[PDB]
Amino acid sequence: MVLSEGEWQLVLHVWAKVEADVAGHGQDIYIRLFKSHPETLEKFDRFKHLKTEAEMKASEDLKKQGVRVLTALGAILKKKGHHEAELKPLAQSHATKHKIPIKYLEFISEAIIHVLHSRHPGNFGADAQGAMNKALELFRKDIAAKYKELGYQG
């Protein structure tokens, strides 16, 4: 469960394209997440009322939230596995305050992969998607371990 440097470079090469417009990517990822797995939207007290994709796209608060998620995830990815410090606050808030199960982290990982596959075929072929999946699996494995330490089954 340790990524090679070549795998990390495939992850970071597609993430650089995400960074051309992190806000737009965040909107697409949230829309995909909520339309593939509607139950996840219920965890968001401020966004749970959104009824349609048009409302999600027009929500300035949701756009800002997407930027926060992707920027936090980008900082984790750029540590190339040395993300202990970054996972501490994230694991605590998601376990104890938002109460986000591991299955829901799997759902957002799937939404990320789906959106990168659609938007970035030039940097998200099979090998690149495999590397991104490995990076997200590592993130989820380490978050799950921290969840257990914090008292949350997940």
Ligand code: HEM
């Ligand atoms: C890649 C995985 C994720 C990352 C990097 C991430 C990151 C963040 C960050 C940085 C924040 C703001 C600070 C904080 O409260 O920690 C946040 C808030 C939040 N997260 Fe996540 N998150 C992820 C997955 C999820 C998922 C899958 C859900 C629910 C299905 C979720 C639910 C929430 C909620 C409800 C908030 C508070 C939102 C608000 O203030 O309106 N998170 N997340």
Ligand SMILES: [O-]
């Ligand atoms: O989030």
